[PDB]
């Protein structure tokens, strides 16, 4: 392995006090460091750790080139929607993954730290869109969506709704409605000089 | 078919008053009897009745030999970890299923018998181990764990943790933290005569 010494900033992205909403999922590029995935693999606090195209145990030996951490917060029962080839309300309007995904998904419950009594409305997700999102594409436009013949413009009429809508997370929600924090590590085995590499020697 | 008729002791292994802790998962061997898996499948109590290598409906016909039953209690959320090719804390340091597994896993919530107001501390699971467990192997020995580069002989000091950690089951302990009773039936089809299977 190349003579590089560093610690990848997984700590900040995993412990950040703020996670952007789904429709504005926050993307960070990680490169030129020595990631140690085992530390987070053995954390034993992640309710879901699904790796596609890469065995989690083998990760320590892999030597990637670019890392992309995409973080956001999703409802409980909709975590399954975050996966390659999946379709639904979030996998096609807010966050679409490519068919040949080659990364990992770490989702863990955050009910205590996110939901508050009376409901939390700081998290917004898109509800109506003209066409399904393309893989790894983010849309922040707030144009009024007209679900009807009437061509409205800037007015929330009978058939014109605000594109976004609030989750409304509260502690008194059964599993499936509690807020789950999700992080996607999209690796890339491109034939370029490896920058991020596992700790071997 | 065999002429034996004595019924297999499924009731006492499924209705047992106490289930062994995961790190010492209770092993039992069933043979020389007649089993009826139809009743087990029909009952709706079992939240999960997963099966690999054989469809549950087909069990009553196929004739196995020297079946085994492994029973224990685990946390509800990590019940997924009891499956071949599944990795994790319990799946690694406590109970590992072989990849070429041909059997069934029946898991059902037992929050009404294993969770209690004081906090049932009689259930323990291994938390630290040098290497991952081999398939179908039990590691009951537990003296000390060394994670401080020092010969921590017999003192639970700094960087010296007891390998076994106790669960905190309580009636109000959420839903994913509630205890779940898990029993896995492992079969086999060897170059030898059969000894236990369904009636005909």
């Amino acid at each position, epitope marked *: 392995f190349p003579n590089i010494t560093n610690l990848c900033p997984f700590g900040e992205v995993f412990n950040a006090t703020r996670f952007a909403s789904v429709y504005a999922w926050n993307r960070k590029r990680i490169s030129n460091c020595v990631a140690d995935y085992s530390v987070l693999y053995n954390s034993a606090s992640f309710s879901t750790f699904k790796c596609y195209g890469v065995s989690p145990t083998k990760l320590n030996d892999l030597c990637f080139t670019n890392v992309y951490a995409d973080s956001f917060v999703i409802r409980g029962d909709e975590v399954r929607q975050i996966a390659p080839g999946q379709t639904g309300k979030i996998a096609d309007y807010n966050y679409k993954l490519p068919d040949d995904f080659t990364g990992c998904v770490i989702a863990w419950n955050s009910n205590n730290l996110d939901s508050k009594v009376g409901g939390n409305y700081n998290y917004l997700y898109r509800l109506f869109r003209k066409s399904n999102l393309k893989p790894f594409e983010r849309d922040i436009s707030t144009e009024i969506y007209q679900a009807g013949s009437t061509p409205c413009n800037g007015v929330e009429g009978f058939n014109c709704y605000f594109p976004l809508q609030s989750y409304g997370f509260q502690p008194t929600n059964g599993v499936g409605y509690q807020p789950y924090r999700v992080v996607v590590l999209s690796f890339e085995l491109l034939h370029a000089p490896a920058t991020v590499c596992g700790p071997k020697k | 078919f065999p002429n034996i008729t004595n019924l297999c002791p499924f009731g006492e292994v499924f209705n047992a008053t106490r289930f062994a802790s995961v790190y010492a998962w209770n092993r039992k061997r069933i043979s020389n009897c007649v089993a009826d898996y139809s009743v087990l499948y029909n009952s709706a109590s079992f939240s999960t009745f997963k099966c690999y290598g054989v469809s549950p409906t087909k069990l009553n016909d196929l004739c196995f030999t020297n079946v085994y039953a492994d029973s224990f209690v685990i946390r509800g959320d990590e019940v997924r970890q009891i499956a071949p090719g599944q990795t994790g804390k319990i799946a690694d340091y406590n109970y590992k299923l072989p990849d070429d597994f041909t059997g069934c896993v029946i898991a059902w919530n037992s929050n009404n018998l294993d969770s209690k107001v*004081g906090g049932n501390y009689n259930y323990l699971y291994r938390l630290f181990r040098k290497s991952n467990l081999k398939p179908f192997e039990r590691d009951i020995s537990t003296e000390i764990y060394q994670a401080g580069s020092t010969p921590c002989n017999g003192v639970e000091g700094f960087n010296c943790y007891f390998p076994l950690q106790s669960y905190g089951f309580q009636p109000t302990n959420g839903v994913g933290y509630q205890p779940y009773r898990v029993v896995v039936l492992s079969f086999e089809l060897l170059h030898a005569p059969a000894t236990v299977c369904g009636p005909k």
Partner: antibody
Amino acid sequence: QVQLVESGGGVVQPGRSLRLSCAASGFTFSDYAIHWVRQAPGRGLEPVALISYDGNNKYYADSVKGRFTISRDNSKNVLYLQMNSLRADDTAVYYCARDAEGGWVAALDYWGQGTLVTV
Amino acid sequence: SALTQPRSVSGSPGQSVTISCTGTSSDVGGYNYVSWYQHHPGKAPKVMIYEVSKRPSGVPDRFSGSKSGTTASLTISGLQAEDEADYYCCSYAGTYPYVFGTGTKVTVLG
């Protein structure tokens, strides 16, 4: 047929001590927690003590903690509550109720008749 | 830290009646383990609703329970002379010693 009874007590001078015994029958006694609840005349109910199945854990109300002791003898299938330094505010009716444990979560299934104690 | 309850409620037979129970974060507003009991005079109290909405076996279907935000509500439909008894609101906080509400006697006009 679950059934709980309590010997109870009568009149006690202020600052003295008292002993209450609750016996249970019809179920495995060393399997369910026990609550001691109090109701003063003209006031609502309020828990006063809680003992787990094995007696290892104890819990008391902040307004009564430090002067009430609770124990249980599983062999004889009985439980005891000792009161010390009784004050005029402690006059009330006491119930030794059973806890649903893993049944009706956070509920008290069966209650005894109760006993009145006056200072 | 007893939960707040209305002192008394009234209603003619047949008409529905409601009883409220207010708490805070580490109360009905937090964990959903509220319960409603009744305490007939000179009798052992019996559970009428457990786990917010569920009901025991044998209790009439008339009783119903709900919980919104930080307040629980017990609604009884079709009162009768047998309902002349106070009801009690119990919740599970972080600690095990439960927090009860306050006496709420239901009066039926006669």
